[PDB]
Design a protein around this ligand. Structure first.
Ligand SMILES: Nc1ncnc2c1ncn2[C@@H]1O[C@H](COP(=O)(O)OP(=O)(O)OP(=O)(O)O)[C@@H](O)[C@H]1O
Ligand SMILES: Nc1ncnc2c1ncn2[C@@H]1O[C@H](COP(=O)(O)OP(=O)(O)OP(=O)(O)O)[C@@H](O)[C@H]1O
Ligand SMILES: Nc1ncnc2c1ncn2[C@@H]1O[C@H](COP(=O)(O)OP(=O)(O)OP(=O)(O)O)[C@@H](O)[C@H]1O
Ligand SMILES: Nc1ncnc2c1ncn2[C@@H]1O[C@H](COP(=O)(O)OP(=O)(O)OP(=O)(O)O)[C@@H](O)[C@H]1O
Ligand SMILES: Nc1ncnc2c1ncn2[C@@H]1O[C@H](COP(=O)(O)OP(=O)(O)OP(=O)(O)O)[C@@H](O)[C@H]1O
Lengths: 352, 352, 352, 352, 352
């Protein structure tokens, strides 16, 4: 297991995002999104199995061997937590491991504007931070969470599969439930969450319509609800959300959403223009009454225009506006911003 | 268990709403909505398990250990009843506990207007008191119930999961059924409720369409039916109610509702402007024939206008009208009322 | 068990409608709709269990203890039959008991007009007597049944859960089947009813669409079919009946109903104006060809007008017309009739 | 087993596509699409069973004998991999075997234009290579895959039933999962694929709507997704894709597809005009913004026109345009191209 | 069993279509469609059971005794194959047996025009031969199959329940799979058919929508697919085919059908006008581009007109046109042709 300790130590030490372990390759680490093979012998099935098994319970070993899959989380005392996935490929064990720092960075350390912190003082509603896997969403969510834990005397509940970031008690009481151990299911967690007197809730992935209904109920019943999506924009998010429902319930969903929605963020971690480190590009939508009317009226497409003009009033920001700030600040290259701009000529006009 | 007795004693003694118990935090109590950590050592899993187990049957212990969840209710002789939820988080026992006083307050003690008491003399129909969890709904419902028990020679049946407020016999015969012990299910309770010759019924949460159909049947079959929702307004409630049905049955539901509906209340407990205690803010809708026509005709949006003008005739009251009374009486601050007003300028006009 | 015999004896002797038995209350009896506690000690769980168990088979005891619910019927030789419901509340046995006289009253004793007796000579179709639970429906149905049994040489079959009124043989052969003992289910009864050569059928409650289809089949296949509903008017009944079907089958249902429907009654037992005894208020709809056209054409709302004008020709009678007769005869008070009148001014015009 | 080794050796040695083994026929090999019986005795059930069993595990033998079917893949060290199907016909074992070379050919060796190689540098999206079974799709896909493995430092994951082409590590980490051994199902693979930090994904056949949704999610969540279809054209492919969804979700699918779609290829292996060897005929669709608008707007039919004019800008190519190049180069005969041309006169005009 | 051998021998010897065996009747044979009782004692249950059991395996005996039904096929060496159905009626064994000659007749022997033989050279698509049971469909299909087996070096796969005609190897490799022995199901056969490298496929009856989708997939994926229906005309066939699909997929089905459909035949065996033997009457539809447009455009009714005019170009032939040829050739009587003519006056006009 000592080898594994050193690989995770190097992952941490090298600012690496993720460690990949598979047979016939040396361990490889993703740093700022790119793989680097380590100067190590190629792994065999014995190596991957013994190292991965060194951090498993008898039940977890039984579980992976029962399913050839295992999602899990674990902590290394004095170092960090990690999220692990173990699987089987070509008849051999393989593993992927995500870092979870013990220390959650602040908005300014993350390059996040102050308006998210003011959102952290909201007593209730749903504010969404979206983007692909590992785009800092759990980390961002954890920063907002830690700020509330520090600042409020409220009840924070998280439901996670598995628990990633740990939020020990500050000013809040924080309870963190791992699905399949602490609670039978997300569904079971929702079966008991209203009897646990929460104020703030982390619900994990918006996996199905039922979870969406649960989130709408939570945000409308006096709770602060946090959730994630893998969508890339506010409009794409809203269309995705409406269309999961049968046609007859989308009117209600639009009214509900207009009432309970407090924010939509769509974020990504990009390689920095300097060639070292990664930088966050984020599109920000803050609903105003006009936007809430657009939500109720099924006039989704014009929402982009509100984000184009909500910079001064509400701190809103289209992705192109974020690319503009990163480009003037030389945080990103011209090609990535233009390659993502829905109107590259527009971003040029904003830049010049 | 003596420790637990003292925490619940302090909860009662301190006018605290809810007690929160979890590991690595001292016991914390929500008083008037806000958490206060007690000057006690942080709890461990052993503490939470032994204390919570001290009030469990062997079956209840088996049940929580079987599910890592348990909703339950219990009484402390000479003190109070309590509703408990026990769950597991981070691999450790946690618990939340709601007070249930033995004495139910009256309308005037609760700040409830006399019209609800006149509603308590209604022989049948459905009157709904809604709001978020712990907004006094069960307490309000219990006060109306106790008034009927005191005043009528009728049959009161409650179905609860679990039984919260106890209503010993006054002038009525009162039977209280806990789902999963007294009856197999809400569904089973409804299977036998018509053969038990009831006059007044408490059905618990409107959890599904079937429960809605049961309530419509009860209110139309000569019974007085009580139910709760977590909606925040009459219009939001009605839209929610109609939209749960398939499109083809909403016409019937509108006709049924127009016939059987006798009242919709949407209430909340707010921190008082004085900074000590909590005050009820409540929106009141009493259907008149005009409103019943609006119900049948699917002209829901104009219902708000009827509540704006039903103050003198029927005692109706919009939320803004309630905020007006609380603001002139300095019961609530200007910011909370304005932050909840659908037209803050309108509330200002009413105030000045 | 002797105590129980005396309570049921008092129930019979006192003209009481229903006996209620539950812990921490003396036995209470509903007489003319209102509860009276008996001058007896409060019951405990032991009392209710021993008394109720004294009239149970080992299977029935097992059944209630298996389900904490039991619907049942039983006879007391030389006294009466009774319908019982036993359940559990607050962890204790409770029971409710309805009287079933051995002697069925006649139309004139019941205040029922002669046209129902002429309906009793109809060879086939469906005539419905509706109203809330215990509104005399089973008793009314039994009177019509007993008249046919007395007058016809036909085959009467009843399917009941449980069997209530017993109809020993007069001129008909009368077979009475209790669901769950005599037959597996209502569905099973319908599976075998056509092979039992019936002429007259009692089907119990119209519990689902399937039962409705069975009743339509029976009435169209040369049988006389009896059924109940808990609806309060002909129009409300018809709308309820049509809307249970998918939209595509309602046209057929309207044609079928127009063919097979022979009568709709909506009845209620009301406290008498004298303050002693109860009086039947009943709305009567007898389909004429015009009404049958209205049934086929989905022009339901105008049916009320036909009942307003079918007094002289067919003996039809709106609820207001019944209230008129009861008011001129001082059988009911002005407030109950007006409180139920869809147009109280209309009833006043009819009265003055 | 030595006999089987020689048949597969001849299959490889003779440039044969596929080996067919069944009773009462000698082994027959498909070379360039056409069967040739080998100068061997006819097989019996004993021959086919012993030879096929010589390459099976006890579980695989049990599996075929349990199901009379088995799909499988295997390698012959120093020779090649093979995909096998074993089944039963007329009560006897039969087998079919596809070659899988250890060496994947390059685009130029395959006659594939350079634009596919530039597509191989795309960081994400879905590019589809379609055509009938054994039309070189897995081989083409493997060539693109091997190019990425050679050129990128990324994570390649394949899910296959069974694994066909093996891609040992070059510059990427490549994990290959066989459904039913490495992973429980395609569904299970998708359950864990997002926790394995992939960059490039091979998903196998687009077998159902769920797989389509998974592919859309992968392409939108920052991954490069590879999939196959057995469709023969871009328009036929798109119509097939849209119509698998319920009508209410096709709008979203069109928006999603317009966002994530990066390429549609429809390919076939044809006998060469020379009479020796086979030649690829391929229709190429590369979405441009105009095409993406056509995708969003449900204006599918005009897509063919864009391919007719996307030769110079994007390297697009209709099937007729491919037939034109093959005909001028005398790679295919006039009859095959004309027999497949949707407008043979158009192809003639292009040729003359 | 010797008796049974003689009955089947007489069936073969007498040119009888089918043998019927049941108790209390002598064996009866259908010759040219009409039953003839044999000059034999009436059968009892013992006779039918022993004779039928004489050709059963222990499993087949168990199977019939388990189900009182059995479909099966068997061969008599040096004589013929037979398709058997064994069942139970009135508590006794009964059996019906269809002949399957070892020698398949040619098109000219069958009176089939040369165009079907040219269709036998088609590399792919679906050509359908329909008609009632025992109308020569399997025999016709077998003749086309045998011609391909003789003429091509391709892979022929049949899936049958049970296998009827046997096609030993000629120039093709022919594998014949009996459902329930060789393969688990038609569904399982389709699960493995694409991994068996087929060129030509016989799929049996088009039993459900899934089979239709499988056939469309096969015909579009480069295979030659054979299937049967019991429809009597091209238009009736097409309407039947479209309407099995949900309304939303019929557009796609029309496009698919227009692409993959290569022929529709609707055939019948009729008693000859001479009074000895039977003659085939067949309606022939060969799709042209105009017809393919009609398929895509849902303009089915006008397809009959194309068959009326496709005689010279494509060899198409309406049923009336076939009756015309048979009537001028005195193969059928005037009454049968006129009794089947959709316009008997039209057939008269064609004849005179
Ligand atoms: N502003 C940031 N700058 C650079 N790296 C960041 C930033 N925010 C988060 N990260 C890093 O992104 C990686 C993923 O973190 P995180 O798990 O929170 O993202 P995620 O989107 O929630 O992943 P998942 O979808 O699996 O939950 C981590 O290495 C984290 O340190
Ligand atoms: N007028 C009131 N003023 C102050 N506190 C009140 C008032 N009415 C009720 N409460 C308190 O609110 C808290 C919750 O009481 P209650 O359970 O009745 O509300 P609830 O909405 O029914 O909760 P749940 O949704 O779980 O059933 C209790 O502490 C109760 O004493
Ligand atoms: N005309 C009447 N006047 C006074 N009491 C009546 C009259 N008719 C019936 N009753 C009484 O009403 C009570 C209920 O009788 P019954 O069971 O027939 O009504 P029900 O509607 O069928 O009840 P359920 O719905 O449970 O079947 C009995 O006490 C009966 O004697
Ligand atoms: N350009 C090419 N020229 C000649 N043969 C080729 C070419 N590309 C692939 N092939 C051959 O086609 C045959 C099938 O290869 P492959 O399995 O990749 O096709 P496929 O469509 O993926 O089959 P399946 O649908 O079963 O996955 C092989 O013999 C392969 O060598
Ligand atoms: N041209 C023909 N002339 C006379 N008899 C024929 C002709 N073609 C086939 N038959 C005979 O028709 C009878 C049925 O043969 P066959 O099983 O092929 O028809 P089928 O429609 O496929 O029956 P099924 O629907 O059960 O598969 C046989 O006796 C066969 O010899």
């Amino acid at each position: 297991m000592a080898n594994m300790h050193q690989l995770l130590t190097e992952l941490v030490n090298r600012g690496g995002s993720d460690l990949h372990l598979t047979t016939n390759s040396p361990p490889q680490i993703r740093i700022d999104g790119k793989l680097l093979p380590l100067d190590m012998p190629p792994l065999n099935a014995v190596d991957t199995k013994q190292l991965c098994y060194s951090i498993l319970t008898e039940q977890q070993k039984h579980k992976f061997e029962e399913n050839n899959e295992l999602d899990l989380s674990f902590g290394i005392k004095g170092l960090s937590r990690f999220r692990g996935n173990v699987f089987v490929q070509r008849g051999a064990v393989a593993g992927v491991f995500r870092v979870i720092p013990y220390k959650i960075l602040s908005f300014e350390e993350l390059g996040l504007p102050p308006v998210v912190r003011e959102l952290a003082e909201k007593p209730r509603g749903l504010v969404l931070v979206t983007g692909p896997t590992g785009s800092g969403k759990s980390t961002t969510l954890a920063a907002i969470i830690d700020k509330i834990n520090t600042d409020r005397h409220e009840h924070i509940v998280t439901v996670e599969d598995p628990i990633e970031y740990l939020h020990p008690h500050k000013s809040c009481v924080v309870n963190q439930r791992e699905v399949g151990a602490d609670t039978k299911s997300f569904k079971n967690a929702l079966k008991y969450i209203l009897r646990q007197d929460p104020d703030v809730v982390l619900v994990g992935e918006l996996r199905d319509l039922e979870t969406i209904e649960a989130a709408l109920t939570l945000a409308e019943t006096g709770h602060l609800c946090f959730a994630t999506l893998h969508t890339n924009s506010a409009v794409q998010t809203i269309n995705r959300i409406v269309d999961v429902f049968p046609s007859y319930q989308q009117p209600q969903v639009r009214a509900q959403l207009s009432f309970v929605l407090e924010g939509v963020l769509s974020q990504t971690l990009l390689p920095k223009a300097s060639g070292t480190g990664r930088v966050l590009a984020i599109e920000v939508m803050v609903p105003n009454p006009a936007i809430r009317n657009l939500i109720r009226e099924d006039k989704i497409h014009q929402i982009y225009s509100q984000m184009q003009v909500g910079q001064e009033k509400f701190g809103m920001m289209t992705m192109n506006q974020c690319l503009y700030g990163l480009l003037q600040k030389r945080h990103i290259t011209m090609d990535v911003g233009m390659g993502r701009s829905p109107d590259p000529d527009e971003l040029k006009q904003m830049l010049t």
